[PDB]
Amino acid sequence: LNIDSIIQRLLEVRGSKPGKNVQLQENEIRGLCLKSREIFLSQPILLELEAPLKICGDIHGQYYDLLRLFEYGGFPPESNYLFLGDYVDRGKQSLETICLLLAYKIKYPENFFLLRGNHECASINRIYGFYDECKRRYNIKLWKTFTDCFNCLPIAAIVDEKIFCCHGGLSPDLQSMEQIRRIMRPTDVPDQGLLCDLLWSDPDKDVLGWGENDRGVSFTFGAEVVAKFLHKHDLDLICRAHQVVEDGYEFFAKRQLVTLFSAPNYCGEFDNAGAMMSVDETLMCSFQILKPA
Template identity: 40%
Template sequence: MTSNSPEDKAAATALKVQGNKAFAGHDWPGAVDFYTQAIEKYDADPSFFCNRAQANIKLEAYGYAVADATKAIELDKDYIKAYWRRAIANTAILHSQDALRDFKTVCRKEPNNKDAKLKLSECEKLVKKINFLKAIEVADPPSAFEGLDLDSIEVDQTYDGVRLQKEMTQEFIDDMIERFKNGKKIHKKYVFQIIKAVRDIVHDEPTMVEVEVASETKLTVCGDTHGQYFDLLEIFRLNGYPSEKQGYLFNGDFVDRGSWSTEIALLLYAYKWLRPKYFFLNRGNHETDDMNRVYGFEGECKAKYNEKTFRLFSESFSALPLATLIGKKYLTLHGGLFSDDKITLDDIRKLDRHTQRQPGQAGLMMEMLWTDPQPQPGRGPSKRGVGLQFGPDVTKRFCENNGLEAVIRSHEVRMDGYEVEHDGRCITVFSAPKYCDTTENKGAYINLGPELKLEYHQFEAVPHPDIKPMAYATNSPLMNMM
């Protein structure tokens, strides 16, 4: 119960100062905690809510950020920063019209604010682009692979890399790794070849791939890598490069935000092509068109290769499996569990992901890519503004009904790189350390041997060339918000 006494206000202000210190140290969860304590002591200061909104934006809890900014505006109708933060949060969850309204308010209240004018212009362009794409959208578009004649594409004599023939080779991958480290690209013919080969492989895999860990082998589960190529190479350096003894499962969100997303996607695809039975890819919520348009992958494909590259990747993403069942014990999927307790593994097996290419705003696919755990029992509205949250009782029932030990998921930053929740039944793994160059989190990955015991490994971010996150997110109000 809050009060408005001077003593409580002073105590709350002191907590806000601690929150500001945590925020300055990039400890976003700590900042949220201090701002929440301040609000619990004194809930009449709009800056407490506005500051918590900014910390929630850093945590990608955009739904919470919108709610906090809205509360700040209710307390002070002229609080420019709150309109600004609500606009950024709405942009992040693709509520572009709502964002546009708030950017217009900021420009009206501060007509000389150049940053606001720039963001308004970017948001207007984004809304026009979204509306245009909706207008030309057809129910069943032709395949981007239609008419793709790889044999007709010549690789000129000046190309200085290893040449790819009809099959992927370790030699080509080794050369590609070094080229990407040195800021070079591979020839567009090879890009097209790799994407087509992998699209064909994953298209024929079930919606839920079922794998066993053979004797004398290891399977490593990695979470989001988000275009952080040099940190991906650090995983391989520490844990071993993919081989028939060292399998990998990458649990979605390979691309967007980080500015080496094409490099990561092509490297993961090349390994999938080389060792399809030992290397697995689950789709994440960022392997989708609407996210790629806002968070950089579309722009990066066009900048480094061409628009055709993005369209091929887009179609291949929609062919990716949505889940992997490891040893009949661990369901691994990007987001989390469902709005209905009746959902079973068989429902996932039966899901036709090829008919519905994009996850949309509701349904099984959306929930598999977007939902998050919460500590409270039951289900609740999503802190992101998309999907929902599920409690420990939901996880317990799902695991018991389906004979599982746990659900392994990704989708959220964890400061330690991983977190075990819901009495051990819900495990989050996140593999992008120092996320977006601003969050002081570790990365992590999980190893499983034939006995299916989970071994957690943490790692730190490594240096990378001086290219900022979201470098290719053209016409997005999210540019430079990090």
């Protein structure tokens, strides 16, 4: 598996017009999936990271925007990265997107991190795009290999014991960090329960406690759930993605939670910007805005 050749080929499309594909050999892609899976399983399901690091929200196959993110934040290993999930579906180039991210994870396993989003699930990416892309450019077996890889992704992370990071949000069933640590991999996402909530919930300013989620699954949570959560676990901030917000990021409950979305002009219809959060050693935050290009 020649990782450097793969990364160089994927980056060659830089400074080009969005849409240009990178056609890697099938065995290479299969290789990235099997190699990265091995690494995912050797690292905790609940990551313990240290700043400085850049945190990114949803990408959704918008490969040319991912390149722009690395451009503004610095290509690995110049900066440590933590992605919050949702690399595939919706966008037209999920393959290049996930391949580049997997290649970086393989080359810099200790300085590059990827969490699971609700779209890194076979039943979801079967509907929203990834499956069609895989079938059109390669074949179904390749999609199945991607599924095996996805089922081994870590679920959450905690930066310097103070910043909790997950894709969707909190769960009424989450009473101890121990619960997340005991989830065994490989695994798929259940239709309810802790694992489901961590990938599917959203914060709601108008709810008291727990509420129904319009996505048709999981719950919504209020500002008080956040405050209580942070306090009992002695954390300072909750960082998540999952929800498209017009400015790329949005603070919730007096800056106790931040939502990050890194795909500008999502689905080609919303006119939202994308954002990336930088956390330094003192844990002070800075946000880079990516205007839709």
